[PDB]
Amino acid sequence: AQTIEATSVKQLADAGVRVGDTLRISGTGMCNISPFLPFDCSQIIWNDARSLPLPESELVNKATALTEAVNRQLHPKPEDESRVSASLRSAIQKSGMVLLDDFGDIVLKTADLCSAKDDCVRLKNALVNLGNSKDWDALVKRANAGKLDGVNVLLRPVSAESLDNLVATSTAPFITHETARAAQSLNSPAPGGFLIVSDEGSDFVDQPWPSASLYDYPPQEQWNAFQKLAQMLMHTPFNAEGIVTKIFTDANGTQHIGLHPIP
Amino acid sequence: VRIYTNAEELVGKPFRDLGEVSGDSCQASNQDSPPSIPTARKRMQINASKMKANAVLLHSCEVTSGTPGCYRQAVCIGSALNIT
């Protein structure tokens, strides 16, 4: 029985690990897909071909962009740009009513997220009713023609809250479905390399635990927390030490190594 | 150039904003005929057409005093609008 120390995947592959050996490994890897859930940091994917990219989603970005474009008109931030004159702006706040800065922006960002015929039909109907176009496709044509850029629309708060809520309920399912796809995507490991497994289920990383479980967050906040977790745990330093209790190659050429902790 | 007095009257009318406009009517001396708010309105709307306006949302026409050059002054302003 040997004592093997390895600081790279290639070193371990050439070491000829056997059951009974003592193994000491340090490097950077990915937690397999506990406060880190959906990750398991007691099992480290250690491979030279880290082909899995961090979870990114054009569809989520389109949803976030739509939500942002509407919120800057219904809930402006300190720095936020106002796209009407100061005087008309000034006049609307003392008025006590709600203005859309930029109707064309909302149409185009909706058309972008909701590109399918069947997506977001209620939101599309709400936008058609605010504009002067016949149907949604006629409105999108004028939007793509540029006829709506910086056009303003005035609506009363009941319609503005119906609109804010329509957008909230149209964007959110895209983000929920994309977080399902993304975590399921991460479940397909690259061929070869190693899977280093704690028999006790102890973590091989020293990473800060999330302050709460992202599964309890609403969709956008959940996606953001998951992107942060993945950014940490898909490229994490790890230290794995113990007695080898099993080693075998799976159908994907990945070598699974079970380690038992040393007292 | 149509004149709207409440924002509520433009609800459901896409429009472009073209900036502030005003009309005025002075009365030089306390002796002279009082300031005419109507004459201010009409100057406002004709200057609205100068900016290629379609309508005006009226902010205010308070009749002020401290204005220099006339005893009391009728200032009357609003936003020039282009209804699509």
Automatic annotation (TrEMBL), chain A:
Keywords: Cell inner membrane, Cell membrane, Membrane, Transmembrane, Transmembrane helix. It comes from Escherichia coli. Belongs to the IgaA family. It is found in: Cell inner membrane. It comes from the Bacteria. Coiled coil: none annotated. Its main location: membrane. The keyword NADP does not apply. GO terms for cellular component: plasma membrane. This is Intracellular growth attenuator protein igaA. The keyword tRNA processing does not apply.
UniProtKB/TrEMBL annotation, chain B:
Keywords: Cell outer membrane, Disulfide bond, Lipoprotein, Membrane, Palmitate, Signal. Residues 24-34 have a biased composition (Polar residues). The keyword Zinc does not apply. It is a lipid-anchor. Disulfide bonds join 26-70, 61-76. Essential component of the Rcs signaling system, which controls transcription of numerous genes. Plays a role in signal transduction from the cell surface to the histidine kinase RcsC. May detect outer membrane defects. This is Outer membrane lipoprotein RcsF. It comes from Escherichia coli. The chain holds residues 53 to 136 of 138 of the full protein.
